[model samples]
Target chain A: SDERLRLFTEHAPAALAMFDREMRYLAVSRRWREDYGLGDGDILGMSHYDIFPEIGEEWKSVHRRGLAGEVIRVEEDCFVRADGRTQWLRWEVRPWYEGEGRVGGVVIFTEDIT
Target chain B: SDERLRLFTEHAPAALAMFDREMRYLAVSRRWREDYGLGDGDILGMSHYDIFPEIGEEWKSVHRRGLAGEVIRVEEDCFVRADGRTQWLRWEVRPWYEGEGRVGGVVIFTEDIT
Candidate 1:
């Protein structure tokens, strides 16, 4: 699994991550942890919403849309950390298909623009 | 000038922009406008600070550092808009040299991760 994840993120210029249908993190790039200041902690299987509980309804909607097979791109968006720091971001959310019309999870590419 | 600016940003996957030593807008990519919801407005020769006056002293210091020839990269950052919206971003700022170490301006690459 690590080898597979490494291949996915090895050449990414920015942070990349994948989430399950439940919005739990499945894989994340090194850049994602470095950029988010997560240090070298293990975060697999963690709920994305639990980590950033401050994320509002708007973003929740985006994730729901992606799960429904919508490819969403937002040029400017915001996320607030648990410590009250705000982060400016641009990102794309697309649902990955497991099989024929079967939604597997979501693939996310994000850049911090603050 | 327009042609040259277009060339600079045409192939950029994310928003690319340049500012003078004074942090005024010199060139911006089409993705910059599209991502920031600028609605095709002309922003040439505008002051970056004036456009986003809500940028705090912390970010101002980063700009100053870039002007001083330091390359700064922030993975998760926040930018508050005048309209009270917050943007989450990841960005890099590097000083561009003109000739013989003479600092010309700053080049910025940013992605909104919100």
Candidate 2:
């Protein structure tokens, strides 16, 4: 379909991932997998906490805030993968809504800089 | 001031910011102020939480993670300005360390997409 929303999501060069309040991954784009080392098997149905246990309190809160209907952004940092390789990335995230504006989950996008 | 380090910080196409471990703002590029609508008085010496109170807990965790020596990248979505205008931005943030491996604070670069 040529829907603008779909176009926006599909054509976006950044990595986009959607997850529920429990941080369980629901969807992720191919770019996300290549840029951040995420994979269909690594993230689907997985809680972010379980996948990236090294995450700090601050990082976790951003996910919580989005679920609460707020948006968040982080700029200029090295993204460490599961294997310990660091890739610089820039990204933002916000709450996703169903048709009626009810919060459904969070949409996160990550752009690899290195 | 013409040094490459200073030049990179001051003239790079992206918005750049530097803060300490406590999230205290140490320096910010001019472009950051213009793009993010941050004011000279609004950010200098202010903590990130004080500046953006609606921040998600997950978002805060990223800052903490960086301080703990972990770098992260995230992307996607609209940025609500103080005046209620939403602008899309992509950004990345990482720990800023002083010479000799001492954690100073964090540095961020933001790009305006809208």
Candidate 3:
């Protein structure tokens, strides 16, 4: 009973999303909506900057590094929320493989501990 | 400048998916579709068994166990594909929260190591 057994990637239970080289929303999960304030909202093809205009240079630097083919993992970090509350997060940011030797885009694994 | 900074759950590098208590699909990420042959398929609210009819007793037991609040992680495992090819997987299966002290369902994180 193992036919079509290649499909296990969606059961990870975390909020996850994929973005392309231009930082457009390539994909997202249900849990992503809770943390992002996107309640059943359609966000595909939207630019991340357009939604969260408050994203700072520090995070942008991390995205740039990921786009350049770097893998970054943070066990803990804090993001100041709209209410000026700091939310803690554990996350990994890495590039997705595209063509041969080409880094097509980035995927971020974010977990909110706060 | 961290206003509206509460979002970050979708940045994980792993292919992750969430399921309800009955093992129906909840949500999934783009990387998950790639690893699982989903190919832009919309699977929300579908039964895992419906898509993967080949899932055997062993995995069913794993899912049942996870639904009961167990976190199972496998460093390596092999599955026989439809074409008689064997593919290796590294995965973690765990429960999702629902009502107080109850497991809502399960979530699985899978990586292909073949």
Candidate 4:
């Protein structure tokens, strides 16, 4: 059953990723790569500016709000993919804090609710 | 270690409890004793259907989704205590697991955020 859920997550037709407070990608799900055109290379230690410069300001605002310990849900976003495709995404972002209960990172789950 | 987390959870300053699939109280936090009117002897074998029967059908619907393994987040709920004093509470309840991965109970975290 656990494997089933894991498989569902892998095949999910959406984008999912974990980022640090600075919007540095920590982990990006396979579906995210397929949707966003990210190659099968390590995205760790890479910032949003390095990946999506066009949406840098918007992504920075998301990271800022998430680091401020807020759970944000937004919709109707258009993102440019590597294959020159524009993907519509509806995303939910939540802050994740560690010891001392301070915002350490964010866990973002996105759905292509086009 | 995990044992430290277990200890901190035991002494946490919130009303934490676990209920079975039937909403029968499985575990109640120690802090719940001072905040709520439930006596140590009375709550374990009780169900929400039996204990807080004064609530309307809308609230009963909340329990139905919870039993179906859905996480529920409700706030500003007024619960009538045994002594007739109404306590305002904010609660988050999510399905919990036992030794296996199957959903067997619910874990509730409540605060008196009145």
Best by lDDT: 1
Q: Which of the two, 2 or 3, has more TM-score? A: 3
Count of backbone clashes, every candidate in sequence: 16, 31, 17, 0
Specify the poorest-scoring 10-residue window by lDDT in model 2 chain B. Answer: B1-10
For model 2, what is the alpha-carbon lDDT of residue B14? 65
Residue-level lDDT for A27 in candidate 4: 58
**Model 4 stretches astray by more than 4 angstroms:** A1-14, A75-88, B1-114
Superposed by TM-score, candidate 1 places the C-alpha of residue B97 at a distance from the truth, in angstroms, of: 33
Tens digit of lDDT per residue, candidate 3, span A64-106? 9999999999999887878899999999999877657788677
- TM-score of predicted structure 1: 0.42
lDDT of 1 by residue, A1-114 (tens): 434543465335579878889998776665786776654334667888888898789879989999999999989988786779998889999987775678877888889798
Per-residue accuracy of model 1 over B1-114 as CA lDDT, tens digit each: 332333355335689877888987666666776776554545766788888889899878888999999999989988799989898889999887765657767888889898
Candidate 3 vs candidate 4: the DockQ winner is 3
For each of the candidates, the C-alpha root-mean-square deviation to the true structure, in angstroms, is 18.2, 20.6, 12.7, 17.6
What lDDT, from 0 to 1, does candidate 1 have? 0.75
DockQ for candidate 1, C-alpha atoms: 0.01
Clashing residue pairs in candidate 4, if any?
Answer: none
Q: Against the true structure, whose TM-score is highest?
A: 3
Q: Write the per-residue lDDT of candidate 2 for residues A71-111, one digit (tens) a residue.
A: 87768778689988987878788987766768877888877
Q: Order the candidates by TM-score, highest first — what do you get?
A: 3, 1, 2, 4
Model 1: residues with Cα > 4 Å off, grouped in runs: A1-6, A77-88, B1-114
Candidate 2, CAPRI quality class derived from DockQ: incorrect
